[PDB]
Amino acid sequence: GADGVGNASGNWHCDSTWLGDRVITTSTRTWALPTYNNHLYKQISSASTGASNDNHYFGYSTPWGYFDFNRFHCHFSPRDWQRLINNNWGFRPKRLNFKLFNIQVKEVTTNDGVTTIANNLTSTVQVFSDSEYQLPYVLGSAHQGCLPPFPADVFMIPQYGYLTLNNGSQAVGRSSFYCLEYFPSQMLRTGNNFTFSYTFEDVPFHSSYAHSQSLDRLMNPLIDQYLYYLNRTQNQSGSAQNKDLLFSRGSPAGMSVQPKNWLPGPCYRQQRVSKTKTDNNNSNFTWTGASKYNLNGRESIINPGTAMASHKDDKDKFFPMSGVMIFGKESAGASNTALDNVMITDEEEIKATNPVATERFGTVAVNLQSSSTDPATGDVHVMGALPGMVWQDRDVYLQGPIWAKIPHTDGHFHPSPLMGGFGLKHPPPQILIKNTPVPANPPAEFSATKFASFITQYSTGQVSVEIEWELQKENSKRWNPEVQYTSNYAKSANVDFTVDNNGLYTEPRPIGTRYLTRPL
Amino acid sequence: GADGVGNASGNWHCDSTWLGDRVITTSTRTWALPTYNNHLYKQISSASTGASNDNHYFGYSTPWGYFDFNRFHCHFSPRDWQRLINNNWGFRPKRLNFKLFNIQVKEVTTNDGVTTIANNLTSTVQVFSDSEYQLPYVLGSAHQGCLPPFPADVFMIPQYGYLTLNNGSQAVGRSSFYCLEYFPSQMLRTGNNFTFSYTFEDVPFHSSYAHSQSLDRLMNPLIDQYLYYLNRTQNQSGSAQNKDLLFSRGSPAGMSVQPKNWLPGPCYRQQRVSKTKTDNNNSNFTWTGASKYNLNGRESIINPGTAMASHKDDKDKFFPMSGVMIFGKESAGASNTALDNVMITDEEEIKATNPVATERFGTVAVNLQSSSTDPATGDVHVMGALPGMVWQDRDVYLQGPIWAKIPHTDGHFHPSPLMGGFGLKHPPPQILIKNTPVPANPPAEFSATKFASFITQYSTGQVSVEIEWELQKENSKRWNPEVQYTSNYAKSANVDFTVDNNGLYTEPRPIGTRYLTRPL
Amino acid sequence: GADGVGNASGNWHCDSTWLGDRVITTSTRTWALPTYNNHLYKQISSASTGASNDNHYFGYSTPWGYFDFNRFHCHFSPRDWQRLINNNWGFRPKRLNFKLFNIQVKEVTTNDGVTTIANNLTSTVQVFSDSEYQLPYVLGSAHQGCLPPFPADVFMIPQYGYLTLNNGSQAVGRSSFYCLEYFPSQMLRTGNNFTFSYTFEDVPFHSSYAHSQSLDRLMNPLIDQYLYYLNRTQNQSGSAQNKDLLFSRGSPAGMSVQPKNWLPGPCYRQQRVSKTKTDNNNSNFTWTGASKYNLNGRESIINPGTAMASHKDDKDKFFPMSGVMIFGKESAGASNTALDNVMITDEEEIKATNPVATERFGTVAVNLQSSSTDPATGDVHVMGALPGMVWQDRDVYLQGPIWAKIPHTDGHFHPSPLMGGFGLKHPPPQILIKNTPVPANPPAEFSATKFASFITQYSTGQVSVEIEWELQKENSKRWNPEVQYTSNYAKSANVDFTVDNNGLYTEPRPIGTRYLTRPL
């Protein structure tokens, strides 16, 4: 496709269409692309900064921008997310369709505060997709600059930059420098457009259900087992205490002691924290007493950690210090900002198979009891994989990420990205875009020295993403009604997920998926 | 094949041929086979020896020898190994071709120091392969008696012996005795020959690359996250200390604290040791304080352990006490021998995903903090499998082993052999060889008693192994040059990997594979 | 091809693809073309300048710019140049593909320091290639203004000028004046593009190998010759001295005296110079004592001269005063600049066949000895071609030139361009470009006088060059590893061949091709 200047090179397709076991989301947004790094690649590092062994880094910043739509609210509207959630046991991405169009390249001259922009028709913008995955993958890091949840919102394209191997503030020989001009890319003038398609590999359905049973309560409450266990090791004959070995068979009465077939999910304990400041130990323990890992000398906090239930029982006032998803709030700030300005996610429905994050996994025997030595018991705070273990993965949220690239390694384990979502060996590729450098008038005599005088300019276009999602419909024989996500029927000053008098789109709370119930 | 006495039954095929995505190695060596155990199977154990509960063993020794080429330098010359390494992201074995020929059976009579050897033409040697895997598999134990790296070197065939079930120095009812004459085997005279072929199962490519990114530095250095975390639990208002809950969003400034999707590899910590004797604690802690496992009462040191980085940062002077590969050095001895006489392997390139072996994995929350109890932090020294972990496996070396038989078990986990290499459910089968017993003159009257008088004899032949290796070529968009294995250009008394004035082949250092760089 | 204003007339093709015995490099760069000499041809000479008989010149300067990509780094990235070098005994250019596109013609008016640029759509730029080689060829002179090594770098088109016959500051009858408008050239507006293809003649592969033997050491160290020579002309009988004629046969003991079949390469001696200022004779001898040639009254220093080894043995501190390639260094200057700001090339691997440049070729008999006159010996400092001679040519460098036009002469000798590279009778032709003159408003009444009022304008576009290189793969039976170009594995502040924090691309050192070794 391509036709003159005065001819639109694409239309506005923004819709969702539901088709039984599929749903097709289509989003279009208007974007703006600044000319980054004044056309330059720059070496960047932590050198001559606040330092901190655990915060050092080496890398480069590119003149390139990139497209990001790795966020559910990029595709589903609240109402749709509602439909999805309330009626489906699962879902996953099948097909992807990307279109880039109505390119407009503007040039801006600024003379004495008086700053004026005009059309540079002959100017070109470059785009290409890293289909071979040869560039460092940054999409799976939950950065900013996705498509706005609200269709009517214009957005700015994020600048592309990447991290290579660092020995604190310094690079090593095996460190990689990538030049994006060393890729074939398609050049567009105002009449041109770019289009491209992708198919998702076979990933399991995201579990948008919650169990209506719990691992420990899986038996028939009305029947005894044919199995036995050691009940008493000291008999009560009014003789005070007197050795003995007494066994009893599993009973409804004593469920906690019946032999069972499975174990709860793996565990890596986290520090508890209360939402009401009072309950909390004084002092600053966010780093000091936070669970973290030690990679080549530097520590990094295990943030969303192994998928564990957030709080036990009623105590909805607690949460793992760094083991849940915390979302912004539009009005929230950089680094200050109180609990009133964020939204914490509650991973409640997985209590049925997963260990609670703040409490321990369980208790282990630690010695060889005998007449002369007492039986001892240790607490187990970290629990790796065990044959017979089962579990759920972290949920996904309307404001959450969708997929991430499984790292290319000799080995991995249940590669569900930890922030939640779809783990793909070959994820939707990165789409790189960039304004083509337009030199200002050069000297009237030749000069070898690098070129520095560029006509400053930026670009705007529309972008369209279409995704085909496969639904896994619900087959429930549950007699009683289910829990559904609903809006509050009562009167109110504002309507959830709308704009205010100032015209700002706002997302009231995070919304997970797990409402419907399957038995274990 | 078979033709008279004066007719060669095979040629000398020793070559390597490179074919884009394949390489075919062919090695021929000259071998010598002694008549072992004077034709006898012997029961063998630790009984009436130095004992030690952890060293007891019951087993048998056979009159049979066996062929072993489970060592890269059996097939690749240095130059080739260089080619392999410097240009390929991976590789693996496809097809195997084994030929045995030019059989010569010599008889030796020795009368009064004057010891003379002559040709026994009518003498036979027996050979056969354990195709059904019905013999105890000894190839995957890094023993001696492989094909010499140097083609011109003659070698002696290892004697075959095995271990069955032992209750310290004693056997049990379920212990197994195998007789190798209870296998059909092919008998060869001087004109005969033995040939055989095998195909490898589908194993992943060995990762002969190093990551040009690290698990913790995977984000876009230029952009904030849309995610938040608990930054301060106590605010600084000049009020000394005053509770509070403050959150901030992920920043390039604070990478160690940004939520991430993945975890570093599993961990089983090892004791650190310095190459310069000074730095080390006095005393003998090699066993005393070495990490080890407890199997049925007896302990065994976890030698090459879980694959972990050998030393952090610059500190190339340290190494895991028993968590790296140590190679001989020709002039090295049995059990004395200093560091000057061995070669220690540095697993450095895997720092990017794997925990360091000497340091800890990370830190875990260990209590339920509150106003009245301080937040506590434990060190974690052992780390099992976690959903979301990724890792590399130990590298392989030119002098290293190539494959090992995955034990036939009801369950296993990431069955990469721990010393490095290819884990095969059905590996190249064992090739058993043996000189056929030739009785000396018997009594002139019959005697039922066991035969003991045998003409002493040995045998020489050539052996040829041909292997077809599948390469996985490099697809890098890295702009800057890579790290290559090179020889030192500068003048020198000796040339690496050659013979000396005395004609002894010598391997200067171990050579791994990981030189080229793929992003994560 | 050609389509409206708002339609890109070409894409960004910048890639390398490796195909067994071929490699295809494709480069695209963004260029800027000034309007040179204000649209005028100018006569130029050395008249009324500093003079110097050896620096006089007559010629002309043209309004035309020209494209130059005669430089390896125009096509190969560092990593690629590494691949080429480390694995191939040779290589050469086969096919050429040139495309010029996305033309943009800008007009610039400048009124009171306020200088503004706009699009002049209807403006045209002229391009054509000297396919018949009728223009003076300037590409083979290692001038500036080639395509930048770094893809992201914008560059300025060199202005075309040429030299004709001069009798110092003056021209002669047979001097030639060439008008570039007297060539058919294609005219382009913003929507037009220019394309063109070329096939290289058959040139020998460049020798990207080093010999693993030397001319003098070609014999069998274990065997005598059957040849004899005159060993002693005076016998030692204790008789002090006493005539005689004694012959011995060639021995491994005396290799320097054994008859041999070949001679080392030709020689034109150069002055030695030390990198450490101390070692050097005081005084300014760069011209005074430099080797040079005398062409029609004027002297010119033999710069890169006959191909000779740069320094003997270990002495890497010396170099031929004007017999090696010296490269800039980005930060280097016009004419000041110390050794710290340049890069000198070491022609070391050719010691094996070529004379050392600073030392003498050898020694010659110079008289007819006899009883009454002593035998005399002269030093030979210049050595022409001799039947039996063999040699290598100067190597080529990643920053070095690729080809040069063999002068059209009645005769030449081993026409390998002296600066290194490929000598072609018909090299890639010169591509001339130029902005078309656009007159400003003329008088309202006719005037015969030459037109002087031009709207000032410049142009920008992309340029693409694609080259198909034929590889000569290595067929080595060397057992030991080879020397490879590698990057230093150790930590560092900067990564070789990248940009710094200021975004400036920098080339660490020169890189030659000769790493692999073929026997003589």
PDB file of N, CA, C and O in Angstrom, chain A residues 33-42 60-66 158-162 177-181 432-437, chain B residues 222, chain C residues 150 152-153 499:
ATOM      1  N   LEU A  33       6.329  10.468  17.950  1.00  0.00           N
ATOM      2  CA  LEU A  33       7.690   9.979  18.048  1.00  0.00           C
ATOM      3  C   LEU A  33       8.643  11.150  17.967  1.00  0.00           C
ATOM      4  O   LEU A  33       8.757  11.798  16.925  1.00  0.00           O
ATOM      5  N   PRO A  34       9.327  11.429  19.080  1.00  0.00           N
ATOM      6  CA  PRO A  34      10.361  12.467  19.153  1.00  0.00           C
ATOM      7  C   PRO A  34      11.626  11.950  18.492  1.00  0.00           C
ATOM      8  O   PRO A  34      11.758  10.751  18.306  1.00  0.00           O
ATOM      9  N   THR A  35      12.548  12.824  18.136  1.00  0.00           N
ATOM     10  CA  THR A  35      13.832  12.351  17.656  1.00  0.00           C
ATOM     11  C   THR A  35      14.798  12.199  18.853  1.00  0.00           C
ATOM     12  O   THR A  35      15.287  13.185  19.413  1.00  0.00           O
ATOM     13  N   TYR A  36      15.042  10.949  19.253  1.00  0.00           N
ATOM     14  CA  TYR A  36      15.783  10.634  20.484  1.00  0.00           C
ATOM     15  C   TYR A  36      17.292  10.813  20.351  1.00  0.00           C
ATOM     16  O   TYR A  36      17.829  10.723  19.235  1.00  0.00           O
ATOM     17  N   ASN A  37      17.970  11.056  21.487  1.00  0.00           N
ATOM     18  CA  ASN A  37      19.451  11.168  21.555  1.00  0.00           C
ATOM     19  C   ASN A  37      20.098  11.991  20.448  1.00  0.00           C
ATOM     20  O   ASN A  37      21.242  11.736  20.089  1.00  0.00           O
ATOM     21  N   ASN A  38      19.351  12.957  19.911  1.00  0.00           N
ATOM     22  CA  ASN A  38      19.785  13.747  18.765  1.00  0.00           C
ATOM     23  C   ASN A  38      20.468  12.862  17.713  1.00  0.00           C
ATOM     24  O   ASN A  38      21.504  13.224  17.146  1.00  0.00           O
ATOM     25  N   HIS A  39      19.871  11.692  17.478  1.00  0.00           N
ATOM     26  CA  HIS A  39      20.275  10.785  16.408  1.00  0.00           C
ATOM     27  C   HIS A  39      21.426   9.865  16.806  1.00  0.00           C
ATOM     28  O   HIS A  39      21.925   9.083  15.978  1.00  0.00           O
ATOM     29  N   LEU A  40      21.856   9.950  18.064  1.00  0.00           N
ATOM     30  CA  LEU A  40      23.115   9.301  18.476  1.00  0.00           C
ATOM     31  C   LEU A  40      22.909   8.079  19.352  1.00  0.00           C
ATOM     32  O   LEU A  40      21.948   7.985  20.115  1.00  0.00           O
ATOM     33  N   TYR A  41      23.808   7.124  19.215  1.00  0.00           N
ATOM     34  CA  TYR A  41      23.896   6.051  20.182  1.00  0.00           C
ATOM     35  C   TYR A  41      24.840   6.555  21.273  1.00  0.00           C
ATOM     36  O   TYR A  41      25.905   7.146  20.983  1.00  0.00           O
ATOM     37  N   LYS A  42      24.446   6.350  22.528  1.00  0.00           N
ATOM     38  CA  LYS A  42      25.287   6.775  23.639  1.00  0.00           C
ATOM     39  C   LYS A  42      25.583   5.608  24.551  1.00  0.00           C
ATOM     40  O   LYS A  42      24.670   4.824  24.892  1.00  0.00           O
ATOM     41  N   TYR A  60      23.768   0.766  26.606  1.00  0.00           N
ATOM     42  CA  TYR A  60      23.757   1.793  25.575  1.00  0.00           C
ATOM     43  C   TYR A  60      22.346   2.318  25.376  1.00  0.00           C
ATOM     44  O   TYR A  60      21.355   1.580  25.601  1.00  0.00           O
ATOM     45  N   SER A  61      22.246   3.582  24.943  1.00  0.00           N
ATOM     46  CA  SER A  61      20.935   4.153  24.595  1.00  0.00           C
ATOM     47  C   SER A  61      20.852   4.494  23.089  1.00  0.00           C
ATOM     48  O   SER A  61      21.786   5.123  22.539  1.00  0.00           O
ATOM     49  N   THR A  62      19.751   4.078  22.440  1.00  0.00           N
ATOM     50  CA  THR A  62      19.650   4.128  20.984  1.00  0.00           C
ATOM     51  C   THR A  62      18.772   5.271  20.553  1.00  0.00           C
ATOM     52  O   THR A  62      17.955   5.724  21.321  1.00  0.00           O
ATOM     53  N   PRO A  63      18.930   5.727  19.310  1.00  0.00           N
ATOM     54  CA  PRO A  63      18.115   6.787  18.728  1.00  0.00           C
ATOM     55  C   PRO A  63      16.719   6.287  18.405  1.00  0.00           C
ATOM     56  O   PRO A  63      15.877   7.066  17.944  1.00  0.00           O
ATOM     57  N   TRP A  64      16.484   5.006  18.670  1.00  0.00           N
ATOM     58  CA  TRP A  64      15.250   4.312  18.258  1.00  0.00           C
ATOM     59  C   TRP A  64      14.122   4.304  19.295  1.00  0.00           C
ATOM     60  O   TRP A  64      14.375   4.240  20.488  1.00  0.00           O
ATOM     61  N   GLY A  65      12.876   4.364  18.836  1.00  0.00           N
ATOM     62  CA  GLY A  65      11.726   4.214  19.703  1.00  0.00           C
ATOM     63  C   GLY A  65      11.193   2.831  19.453  1.00  0.00           C
ATOM     64  O   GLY A  65      11.625   2.176  18.514  1.00  0.00           O
ATOM     65  N   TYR A  66      10.270   2.365  20.279  1.00  0.00           N
ATOM     66  CA  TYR A  66       9.712   1.030  20.065  1.00  0.00           C
ATOM     67  C   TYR A  66       8.246   0.993  20.485  1.00  0.00           C
ATOM     68  O   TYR A  66       7.809   1.829  21.282  1.00  0.00           O
ATOM     69  N   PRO A 158       8.117   5.169  23.666  1.00  0.00           N
ATOM     70  CA  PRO A 158       9.269   4.976  24.566  1.00  0.00           C
ATOM     71  C   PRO A 158      10.579   4.922  23.777  1.00  0.00           C
ATOM     72  O   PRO A 158      10.591   4.461  22.629  1.00  0.00           O
ATOM     73  N   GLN A 159      11.669   5.386  24.363  1.00  0.00           N
ATOM     74  CA  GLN A 159      12.955   5.268  23.700  1.00  0.00           C
ATOM     75  C   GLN A 159      13.534   3.889  23.987  1.00  0.00           C
ATOM     76  O   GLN A 159      13.338   3.359  25.068  1.00  0.00           O
ATOM     77  N   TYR A 160      14.223   3.300  23.012  1.00  0.00           N
ATOM     78  CA  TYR A 160      14.840   1.975  23.178  1.00  0.00           C
ATOM     79  C   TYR A 160      16.287   2.069  23.647  1.00  0.00           C
ATOM     80  O   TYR A 160      17.100   2.828  23.099  1.00  0.00           O
ATOM     81  N   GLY A 161      16.578   1.291  24.689  1.00  0.00           N
ATOM     82  CA  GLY A 161      17.907   1.168  25.280  1.00  0.00           C
ATOM     83  C   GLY A 161      18.053  -0.211  25.927  1.00  0.00           C
ATOM     84  O   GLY A 161      17.077  -0.875  26.258  1.00  0.00           O
ATOM     85  N   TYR A 162      19.277  -0.660  26.109  1.00  0.00           N
ATOM     86  CA  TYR A 162      19.469  -2.026  26.581  1.00  0.00           C
ATOM     87  C   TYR A 162      20.702  -2.188  27.469  1.00  0.00           C
ATOM     88  O   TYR A 162      21.623  -1.341  27.475  1.00  0.00           O
ATOM     89  N   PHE A 177      27.493  -4.867  21.903  1.00  0.00           N
ATOM     90  CA  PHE A 177      26.956  -3.616  21.370  1.00  0.00           C
ATOM     91  C   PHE A 177      26.149  -3.843  20.059  1.00  0.00           C
ATOM     92  O   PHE A 177      26.681  -4.324  19.053  1.00  0.00           O
ATOM     93  N   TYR A 178      24.867  -3.495  20.070  1.00  0.00           N
ATOM     94  CA  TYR A 178      24.023  -3.720  18.897  1.00  0.00           C
ATOM     95  C   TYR A 178      23.688  -2.399  18.210  1.00  0.00           C
ATOM     96  O   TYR A 178      23.301  -1.432  18.867  1.00  0.00           O
ATOM     97  N   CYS A 179      23.866  -2.357  16.893  1.00  0.00           N
ATOM     98  CA  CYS A 179      23.511  -1.185  16.109  1.00  0.00           C
ATOM     99  C   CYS A 179      22.258  -1.480  15.304  1.00  0.00           C
ATOM    100  O   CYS A 179      22.257  -2.393  14.471  1.00  0.00           O
ATOM    101  N   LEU A 180      21.191  -0.712  15.546  1.00  0.00           N
ATOM    102  CA  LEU A 180      19.901  -0.980  14.894  1.00  0.00           C
ATOM    103  C   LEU A 180      19.847  -0.596  13.404  1.00  0.00           C
ATOM    104  O   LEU A 180      18.947  -1.044  12.687  1.00  0.00           O
ATOM    105  N   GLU A 181      20.793   0.219  12.940  1.00  0.00           N
ATOM    106  CA  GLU A 181      20.875   0.507  11.527  1.00  0.00           C
ATOM    107  C   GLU A 181      21.491  -0.664  10.771  1.00  0.00           C
ATOM    108  O   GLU A 181      21.534  -0.674   9.553  1.00  0.00           O
ATOM    109  N   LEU A 432      10.615  -1.747  16.141  1.00  0.00           N
ATOM    110  CA  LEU A 432      11.478  -0.574  16.330  1.00  0.00           C
ATOM    111  C   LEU A 432      11.127   0.531  15.334  1.00  0.00           C
ATOM    112  O   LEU A 432      10.995   0.277  14.145  1.00  0.00           O
ATOM    113  N   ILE A 433      10.993   1.758  15.813  1.00  0.00           N
ATOM    114  CA  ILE A 433      10.710   2.868  14.919  1.00  0.00           C
ATOM    115  C   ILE A 433      11.653   4.032  15.219  1.00  0.00           C
ATOM    116  O   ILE A 433      12.251   4.073  16.279  1.00  0.00           O
ATOM    117  N   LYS A 434      11.759   4.989  14.298  1.00  0.00           N
ATOM    118  CA  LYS A 434      12.777   6.037  14.379  1.00  0.00           C
ATOM    119  C   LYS A 434      12.605   7.044  13.251  1.00  0.00           C
ATOM    120  O   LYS A 434      12.318   6.690  12.104  1.00  0.00           O
ATOM    121  N   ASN A 435      12.764   8.312  13.578  1.00  0.00           N
ATOM    122  CA  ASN A 435      12.727   9.343  12.549  1.00  0.00           C
ATOM    123  C   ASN A 435      14.046   9.327  11.793  1.00  0.00           C
ATOM    124  O   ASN A 435      15.106   9.191  12.389  1.00  0.00           O
ATOM    125  N   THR A 436      13.994   9.427  10.473  1.00  0.00           N
ATOM    126  CA  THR A 436      15.238   9.443   9.704  1.00  0.00           C
ATOM    127  C   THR A 436      15.875  10.818   9.761  1.00  0.00           C
ATOM    128  O   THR A 436      15.225  11.833   9.499  1.00  0.00           O
ATOM    129  N   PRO A 437      17.153  10.852  10.124  1.00  0.00           N
ATOM    130  CA  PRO A 437      17.945  12.078  10.239  1.00  0.00           C
ATOM    131  C   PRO A 437      17.940  12.927   8.976  1.00  0.00           C
ATOM    132  O   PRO A 437      18.281  12.446   7.900  1.00  0.00           O
TER     133      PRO A 437
ATOM    134  N   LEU B 222      16.311   3.056  30.174  1.00  0.00           N
ATOM    135  CA  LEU B 222      15.889   4.447  29.916  1.00  0.00           C
ATOM    136  C   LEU B 222      14.520   4.763  30.417  1.00  0.00           C
ATOM    137  O   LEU B 222      14.133   5.921  30.413  1.00  0.00           O
TER     138      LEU B 222
ATOM    139  N   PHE C 150      30.410   3.437  10.879  1.00  0.00           N
ATOM    140  CA  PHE C 150      29.197   3.307  11.676  1.00  0.00           C
ATOM    141  C   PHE C 150      27.959   3.659  10.846  1.00  0.00           C
ATOM    142  O   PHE C 150      27.861   4.762  10.277  1.00  0.00           O
ATOM    143  N   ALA C 152      24.875   4.427  11.652  1.00  0.00           N
ATOM    144  CA  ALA C 152      24.034   5.530  12.114  1.00  0.00           C
ATOM    145  C   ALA C 152      24.625   6.903  11.810  1.00  0.00           C
ATOM    146  O   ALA C 152      24.012   7.930  12.085  1.00  0.00           O
ATOM    147  N   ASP C 153      25.814   6.921  11.225  1.00  0.00           N
ATOM    148  CA  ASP C 153      26.507   8.177  10.993  1.00  0.00           C
ATOM    149  C   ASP C 153      26.106   8.772   9.654  1.00  0.00           C
ATOM    150  O   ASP C 153      26.194   8.114   8.616  1.00  0.00           O
ATOM    151  N   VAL C 499      30.528   3.241  20.657  1.00  0.00           N
ATOM    152  CA  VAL C 499      30.419   4.671  20.858  1.00  0.00           C
ATOM    153  C   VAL C 499      30.658   4.931  22.342  1.00  0.00           C
ATOM    154  O   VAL C 499      30.426   4.056  23.191  1.00  0.00           O
TER     155      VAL C 499
END
